[model samples]
Each structure stands twice: as structure tokens, then as C-alpha cells.
Target: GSSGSSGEEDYEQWLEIKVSPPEGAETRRVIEKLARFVAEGGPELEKVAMEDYKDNPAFTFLHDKNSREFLYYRRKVAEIRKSGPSSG
Candidate 1:
């Protein structure tokens, strides 16, 4: 996964998926499908912000596009606790 930083962050989490199909199928088609799947999970990621990082000082959504087949997802958390911080 690729991301841009604020030049000062304590921690970060990134998610990436690699999907490679056989030689005949359209690679773009496969990537688009996987991208759709990843998009489906977008809400889930945003939900975390609503349920958890809403009050945090900094947060971001990151994605990577290269090679036309590889993709990455990232969620940045700065000054946000990983656990035990109830949604406020």
C-alpha cells in the first residue's frame, strides 16, 4: 500500500489485496470486480471513523493505483487510540 503522510504521525494501518487470474480473462475486468468488492468495504471503513475516530485529531483514507492490477487501502490514525477508547 502507498500513502502520503502529514510528515508527523505516530502510526498507520494499510490494507492491500492481490488478485491475479489466468491468462485469458480480461485483467481489467478482474481488477474492476475486485475494486468493487473493495468499494463495498468502503462503508465499513468509514463506519470506523464514525464509531471511533470521529473525535480524533487526524485521519485519512489512502489508496494506491499502479500496475493496473495492484491496489492498496489505507486508513491513517494519529493521536487515536487503538483500543479502549469509547466513541464519544
Candidate 2:
């Protein structure tokens, strides 16, 4: 029999932080900056994982076999958001 894949199961995790927006235009600006940071920071995070903990089992969770799939879903979500509502 073929060996079963260990990381084929769908797993998702999310963290939500709630913060009140500051007054006026600064609120929008700060929120936009924060969002951009997170969107752009993922690569740095992965790089750190590989560089700092490549041999540590404890860091396995940070760079797991399912990482590519996780990124795939993330990209799909971004695409959906960009496309907006479907006409159908």
C-alpha cells in the first residue's frame, strides 16, 4: 500500500486582535500601515524560521510540510478579495 501523506489534512489558524481606531485620518493611515506590514512580513517570517531554526524539531511547526498549502490558500483568499463580488 502507498504511504499515506502526513500533512494532507486541512488545518487553519488565525489570530484576531481588536483595537479601536484613533481619531480622524490617522486612524485610517495606521490601519493601512499595519495591514501592509503583515501582508509583506510573511516572507521575512519564513526566512527567519529557516535561518534560525532549520534543525530544531520545536520549530517544525513554523516550517511544516503544509506550509505551501497554507500559502496557497492565503493567495486564493487574496485573489477572492481582489476580485470582489461575483456577477453570477
Candidate 3:
């Protein structure tokens, strides 16, 4: 249920997921697919990545290369949250 706080007091909840890369897997396809959907802006890229990963159930198949790629991105997201943004 929504917090239902009135007006500007409302805040969105967040979910944090962490996953490890699958060894001996090819993740280029997933990366490319994600790249194709994103532009070079912060909000746009964030929306794209979140929506793409959320919709792609292949990300749950640990043995699949594309799934592994999504997991890798998820891991990187965690790292960024823990630290500041990446230097480069």
C-alpha cells in the first residue's frame, strides 16, 4: 500500500537487489540491449536500466549469459550506492 502521505510529504520506497556475475558466461548481449535503450542522460539512463532489468525475467536464470549480465549491472549499481559514483 502507498504511504498515502499528503502532498509533498510523500516518498517513494526503494528495493535494493544484489547479484554476482555468472562465471564462463557471455553478457555482451544483455549489455548491448541495455545500451540500445538508454541515452546519455542521468534520469533517462536510470529509468531505462531500472525498467529494463525489472521487466527482463531472463535476469533470474543464473546460468544464462544475459541474465548474468543483468546481475553484473545490478552488482555495479550496489557498488555505486555504497560508494559515490564511479570516477570514470
Candidate 4:
């Protein structure tokens, strides 16, 4: 008789989203990086890891996997993960 809910409760989607904070990099770098991949991935969200977009560009920084650079980059990643207070 009204335009409101019919006495039924709420509905849920059982959503569990794990958002990565743009891979710990500042939004500027991550922002443009995503643009590079968005042209490639078409659609990405929450926090698309560069790896997902790594294939699209000849990007040296993201593509770096040598000895020292990779080691340093990896260290930051490990720490980022550690920053998390919860886990699966």
C-alpha cells in the first residue's frame, strides 16, 4: 500500500573485498600506471597490481627485476603486507 519496503528486512551480497592500497605507491605513480594498463586491461579496480598491467608497457620501473632494484622493491612489498593487521 506504500512505496516503502514490504516489511522484509535487508538483503546482502556476501561481499568480501580485499583492497590493496595502490601497491603502496603514491597515487600519482599508481594513477598513471593504471592508465597505462587501463588502456590494456580495459577494466580494473580496487587496486590493480602493476603485475597485471606490467605486460602492457616497456616500463622500466615496474619491469625492473634485476638484483638490487628488485631486492629493494620486494622489501617494500613485504613491509606493506606486514602493515596489514588482518589476514585470510
Best by lDDT: 3
Q: Which ranges of candidate 3 are over 4 A from the true structure?
A: 1-25, 39-41, 60-88
Better of 2 and 4 by lDDT: 2
Candidate 1 Cα lDDT to native:
0.34
lDDT at 64 for candidate 3? Answer: 49
Which regions of candidate 1 fall more than 4 Å away from where they truly are? 1-25, 43-66, 71-88
In model 4, how large is the Cα lDDT of residue 50?
51
**Comparing 2 and 4 by TM-score, which wins?**
4
Score every model by TM-score: 0.24, 0.27, 0.29, 0.28
TM-score of predicted structure 3: 0.29
Model 3 residue pairs with clashes = none
Model 2, which residues run further than 4 Å from truth?
A: 1-40, 67-88
> Candidates ranked by lDDT, best first?
3, 2, 4, 1
True-structure lDDT of candidate 3: 0.44
Q: For this target, which candidate reaches the highest TM-score against the unseen true structure?
A: 3
lDDT of 2 by residue, 1-88 (tens): 9778543112222212122221323333433332333344545645664566588654443456554333343433333334334463
- Cα lDDT tens digits, model 1, 1-68, are 69875643333333122233333135445333333443444456445534453553322212223432
